[PDB]
Amino acid sequence: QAAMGSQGNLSAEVEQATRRQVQGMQSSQQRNRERVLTQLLGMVCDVRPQVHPNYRI
Amino acid sequence: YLSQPRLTYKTVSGVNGPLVILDHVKFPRYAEIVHLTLPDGTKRSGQVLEVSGSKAVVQVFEGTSGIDAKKTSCEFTGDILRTPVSEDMLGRVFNGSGKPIDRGPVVLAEDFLDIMGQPINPQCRIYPEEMIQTGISAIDGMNSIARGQKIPIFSAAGLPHNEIAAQICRQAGLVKKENFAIVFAAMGVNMETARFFKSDFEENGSMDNVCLFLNLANDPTIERIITPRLALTTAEFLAYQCEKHVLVILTDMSSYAEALREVSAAREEVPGRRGFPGYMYTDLATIYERAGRVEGRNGSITQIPILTMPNDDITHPIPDLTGYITEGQIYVDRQLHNRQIYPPINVLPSLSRLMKSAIGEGMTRKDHADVSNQLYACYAIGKDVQAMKAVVGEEALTSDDLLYLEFLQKFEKNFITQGPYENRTVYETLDIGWQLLRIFPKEMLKRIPQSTLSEFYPR
Amino acid sequence: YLSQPRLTYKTVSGVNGPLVILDHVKFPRYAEIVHLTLPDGTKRSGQVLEVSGSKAVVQVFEGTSGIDAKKTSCEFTGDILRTPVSEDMLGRVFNGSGKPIDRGPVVLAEDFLDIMGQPINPQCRIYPEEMIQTGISAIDGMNSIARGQKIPIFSAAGLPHNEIAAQICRQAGLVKKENFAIVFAAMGVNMETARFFKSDFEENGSMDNVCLFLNLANDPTIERIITPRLALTTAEFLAYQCEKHVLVILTDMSSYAEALREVSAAREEVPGRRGFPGYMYTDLATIYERAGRVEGRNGSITQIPILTMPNDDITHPIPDLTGYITEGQIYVDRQLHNRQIYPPINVLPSLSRLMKSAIGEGMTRKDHADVSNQLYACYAIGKDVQAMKAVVGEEALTSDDLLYLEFLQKFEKNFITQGPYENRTVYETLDIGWQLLRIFPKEMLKRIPQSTLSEFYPR
Amino acid sequence: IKMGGLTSEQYHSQVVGKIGYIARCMQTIDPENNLKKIREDYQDVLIWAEKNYRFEEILEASKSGKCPNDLDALSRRSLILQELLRLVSSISPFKMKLDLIESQYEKMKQHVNLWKSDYHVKLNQLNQLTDYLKNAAPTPKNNFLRAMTSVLQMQIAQYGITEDNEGINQLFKLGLHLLAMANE
């Protein structure tokens, strides 16, 4: 009976930890998202065409 | 970062076995990765096995079946193969080429490392020193592993070398007289054994520490070639950058050497000894010697190659070269296995050339070396007496020889024999050793110094 | 039929050992036949080993000595090698290529058959169950032949395989409680062997049933590629169409295999073990597997090749692949011959895979299988004890081991040893086997059920 | 990347297959929506059929992750309905009561590994007896089996399969002995 019961508590515990981690991750993302996105799009737009460094003539 | 866009060629000029030959390639790289689309929409990776002028020979990971000229496209990825590494892959299960097969996400890289790595600078490598305990008494007590040693578990086909490897994976850890990590890497492991590994590590709580790479027996042999290198690249990241002691368990290096043979024959090199390539020594060295402690970084990499010795011939190129490069040997033995002893580790031919660094006060305990030597001596004398018994008869034996026979029995039955899920600290293995050595009165333990006998023997 | 004129090319482009490479050939046909007029009128034959565009690589049967570019005229016959066959081929002697050398006329074709032979449907191939009473006890009692079995006589240089084969030929007949035609393909047999076989077939008055295809030692060494195919094609005509029971002898499959090696080396194919072509297994299967019965037809082909094992190594490719393809080998042993035991048949390494279903109640006798198994077991144990006796001397041997040694001695003396002109019926061979088994007490005959012990043992 | 060994395309087609199959199994066992608790437990997968859709619509939703698309969970949930459907069908002349059916369903859902279960073994044995009779000829063996298996179906209707009812155990043992005995 103890085994039948306590595993519910353990499940609640582990899901609680998972929810906390997901919240922390989502918060950090929602904070740094703008500065990552602007950089990423700027890097996409900055083309800088170059010939292969081995080209001859 | 590579900004330039990738070139995709439909110029396949031949398909010869596992190789697709493309021509008019612009400045091919050797070892460049390729993603080639078959006519029917399927996709297969490949590695530029060779280069010449405007030609590139792409070893397609999966077979070349269904490839053709005139419709197969072949994107050149413009860089060598690189593994994404993080701590996140500690606690994951991957197939031979870094694809997750635990239904998790693709790894969010902390870095991209070239899987060939570089050789550790011999003037930066350090001596291994302290012990890594595997829980298996037969190697913790008698063949202990120093942090940075490379010690292979020789075993014949059919012996439980896979089960021993799994036990080491589930039990290993620092002697704790929490920065330990494991990198399991199964090469050429059949599906049932791979499932055994995956489910065992998942079930027995160890998955937090273990990054498990699986190259099933029917996965591409090129993925087999690159699996040990992925394993060791992750091990180098976790050890020399995350500073946590890693234990790399490469499984079935014979099944790795077979893939090496296949790739050589694909290159159309002539065979070396016993059919294996001539350079197998350098290659196996490149795999093994990515190990050991390094000055100025508190991590390390220990290795435990596991070898299926063909025909049980210790002269065969795989075990011979592995003995040349590694620092010991642990024999899984067929007579013990048949007698149904587990772990059938035969401690007479087994050896650990750096055990002398992993033991002693402050690392395992004051009496480790002495108990190991005495157990070995009494075990060998007991085997001698057991050979003699059947010739001279039991009643022709002296009382000392009966003591040795009893010690042989109880050493094979209480110390060597462990059961898969029994984890014994090195301290417990030593106390079992003492419980066996007390079969003898002190005067027979001639290899133990009196300063130790007087301290440990009583009780 | 072929009404079109044959093209004749003076276009030879090469001569290379047995080969003749042409060029500018119009639509070459692989396996086509070619008639080479050499400069001096000598007319040879050859087969197109491979075609490529306009090229053909002829393989000249009568050799290439004297051939030259710019004057040798190769007439391309336009069809694969179709040989004539007629029932009156029985009682003729033909050279290696099927031309007459008995001073009789060429074979006025009753039909034309492709020497390769059209393969037979495994669903309507019958299982051979009628045992041939070869008369040789070392065969009938322990390795019995069944009418349809491919059962080569492995032997070595200097052993009496010719005498054994001649005895089988002149003694073979069904079990009493249908007279064999013979088709004999001599390959690389010296004149003494060819004349022995011929003189024996005349001495036994059998010539009206024998069709010899001689390719002597001094005859050209590519012709013995097709000589066995000619022999088996005539055998198939006699068996599956004329309804006769035919016993095919092939004198030296090793000379055949060495002709194959010659051609393979001349073509510079990738060579297999010991230099023989890799496809030797398939090419020997197309020779051996033309034995056996077939539904509807009343004829049958029994096949008794003969192999000279080089260096007496039964693992050499010729005997090894012949043992894969043929239903078990009779084995002629130098260690017996040097002791002067004729026939030198060693019963340990020889078996007849169709024996088991060709013996028993109503077919030979109730005790046949049990006597065979028990004699084999007793002989094997006797050989082991004989090996031991050299080490431990006759004092250390137990009386049971002495019983076994006596059985071995009297088994070689009575059961194997046999007059060259003596045909022991299967019943006599079994009685002689029991005479030996009764050396042992009934308790030691473990492979004989109690019923067949009690019924037969005490008499 | 492969999921479960199936290319993700096949994986999502299989998900849509399980969804359609659970819809079919419900429509078979309970056309009059009497089995309400089961209906609610399968609402999430049933909704995609209770509301009409195109196969490619459901496949798009699954590939987007909007559907229930964990193929293992779907397989388990489908197997429960499949075994319950076999229970109800293999006793069709003796259809059992709704509350008993729901109890059977609940016990089956609770079972750790339904496929390897004694609950499934008993259904297999009942089917072994029943399927043999769909074409058997008039003879004493077949008449005895028909009678004994009909009373077995009755008893199954009365006591489900969760109960290791002794009458049903006896009927299984004897019916199978009779089935195994040679016709002569």
Add this chain to the structure above:
Amino acid sequence: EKKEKQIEQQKKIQMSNLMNQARLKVLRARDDLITDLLNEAKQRLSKVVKDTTRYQVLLDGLVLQGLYQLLEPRMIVRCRKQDFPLVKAAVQKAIPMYKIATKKDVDVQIDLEAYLPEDIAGGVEIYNGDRKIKVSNTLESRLDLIAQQMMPEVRGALFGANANRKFLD
């Protein structure tokens, strides 16, 4: 004791398996956040494409990048129908710069016959004369080729650097 150990062993398996699924769940949530970020990036690139003035410069870059990567004598630029005037201008400006930087003569045609799918965000695909070699400089391709390389820096920026990672070589 053996029965109690059975219950304890089941407890161990269940706790282990539950914790493992929790680990994968958090990691998959992280991957999901990254996927959200990349979808946002794709939409932002579409917004950029809407603005011709910058888009013209972006195409001037992409077309010439394709020409440089191919270095062929005869070439064919494939673009969306919406973009044709802009890609025309891009090719017209790119040809002289190609000549000067590579010294090669070149002939660049625009594939009016078969444009890219209208769903494509933008960019170009440059084929060589016989169409057996293709360089795919569409914006989606570039964004992928950039994000896959950026992930380390993206992980660092979004979810904070790894404190365990003492050394970077």
Add this chain to the structure above:
Amino acid sequence: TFGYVHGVSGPVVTACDMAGAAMYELVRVGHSELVGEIIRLEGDMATIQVYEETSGVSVGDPVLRTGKPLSVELGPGIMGAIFDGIQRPLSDISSQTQSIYIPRGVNVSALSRDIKWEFIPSKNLRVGSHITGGDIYGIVNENSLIKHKIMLPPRSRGSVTYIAPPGNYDASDVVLELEFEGVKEKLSMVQVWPVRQVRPVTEKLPANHPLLTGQRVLDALFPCVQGGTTAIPGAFGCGKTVISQSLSKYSNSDVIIYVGCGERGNEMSEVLRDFPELTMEVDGKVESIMKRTALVANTSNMPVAAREASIYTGITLSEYFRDMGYHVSMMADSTSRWAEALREISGRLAEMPADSGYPAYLGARLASFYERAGRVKCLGNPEREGSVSIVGAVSPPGGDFSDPVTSATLGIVQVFWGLDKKLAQRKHFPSVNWLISYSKYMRALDEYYDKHFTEFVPLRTKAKEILQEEEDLAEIVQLVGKASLAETDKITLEVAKLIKDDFLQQNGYTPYDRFCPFYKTVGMLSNMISFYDMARRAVETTAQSDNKITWSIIREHMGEILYKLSSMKFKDPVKDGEAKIKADYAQLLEDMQNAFRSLE
């Protein structure tokens, strides 16, 4: 569209104008339309293996270009068929050409299109219902044993637009017709699958159920399992015949598939003759074994390419019935003669060899063959789980254990019943080398044993221990002599002889030991090991004491008991009941206890 032959060297035909031909595609060479398979490409020239004798092909011969890889037809008709290595039905070729030869380029269809199979749709399917790959949309009454569950092909999908009513249909009739994204697909009862592509499964599962052969040695000391991978040498008097036919007549397998990769002609004519004669009890009726078996005959003289493709055709048929849901069992008569085809083809293609000449990819090929084994959760909607056991005979030269095929096999197969030539020469059958043979499935099966035969595992361990101790002791006995042995050693020897002669020895041709059920096997081993335990108990208890008991006393004291322990093997389940045999073995245990208690 179609190319032209350009070179011919045995079974390798280089063909020009094959511009777009796809690797491993099928082509129709020559004017006779021989079947061929592209094995290489160079520019516009393909290179074509040919599955039929090429003698008489000429340059310029049309090479027609079928757009499908080597594929096997799967549908109602397989059960009972005798197939050529590439699916050609030998029986229909015979009945159709009315002559005993296989014409070159014969093109009779794999499955008869004339038979009116009885097809019954799955009742709950309807127009518009969604189905996916592997769904069982109908069932065909192929024969009284196998109900051929017709499955939507893998890689198929969509909404049903027409599902045929119950009736009788040809293998060609459109039986179902379904739509996906606006494209319609019409399905008949026969599908086509490339033999070299693994037939997909939802999930592979551990192989945790025993596959009982007839042999006590194998069922006990080296268990095989549903979906297990096994290797055996091709022995004589045993091996190929005894085990195959015993598994056929009775085992846990619902379908048996055989593949004679390189079988000798007359041995193949033996198999094709015995199998249609064998019968089995099912529901109290004797039914043929060809109602649940299929044979892929490939005699040694048939082309090398076909000798290679035989294994794949067999394994694909086995996987088809696995997907249906059966516990299929496959016997491959010679993977060694298969490795010969691989070697020869590699040589002809001019590839670099490896150890002993075999192509370096032999390991990968053998893996791709074996690893299709196992217990699987089949695709498709109606939940089910079949399996495909695989048992591949090996035949290294002269019994060599380093032979590359044997080595690569040992690296893949979970079970290996190696061969002891000493026993073979003694005529001790089975000839299993119980010292180097192994089975890695014991870990799995211990659960099944702890649920069904709870006492079997310690018996197995003690039997292995006894065999090994006797092996050890014989080395001394032969070097010195038996005088020095103690009572424990004597009992170990004299019980190991009992085990080796009366438990691990089985006459497969007798009515009683043609097949040894597991209750009989565990009863036998239980009695023998109980005898060992109680003899050792007596001697151990009375050692170091004056009233000493010895084997010399026990043997004479209860000679009857030893006789009955030896005679246990003769009990016959076919007439003696399971109850009778269990009671007899328990009575022998009782007699043993009484005899030992009296000796004490």
Add this chain to the structure above:
Amino acid sequence: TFGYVHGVSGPVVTACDMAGAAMYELVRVGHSELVGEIIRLEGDMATIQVYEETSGVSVGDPVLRTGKPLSVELGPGIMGAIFDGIQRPLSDISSQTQSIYIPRGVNVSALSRDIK
């Protein structure tokens, strides 16, 4: 002068435009300047056994022809030194590059020029 890489098959690199190269001369292949030894000449090509891993070398990579065969640099500074067999100074590689690895194609001068 410079040659150019014309092929790469494992360690065996094949370089064009090496007309004057001396047999068993050393060359620095690729942009990372991996060491290689000319084991063959043919025409104006050369076969170069590259000592270090070739992964990443590409056609067209410059091949800088060292003027001397495998040679040791002899002078002050040898004493107390640690050298790889090729005369690479490890006790300077580790110090200068602050890394535990031998950089692929490292080019540290064997004897320090800096120390007086």
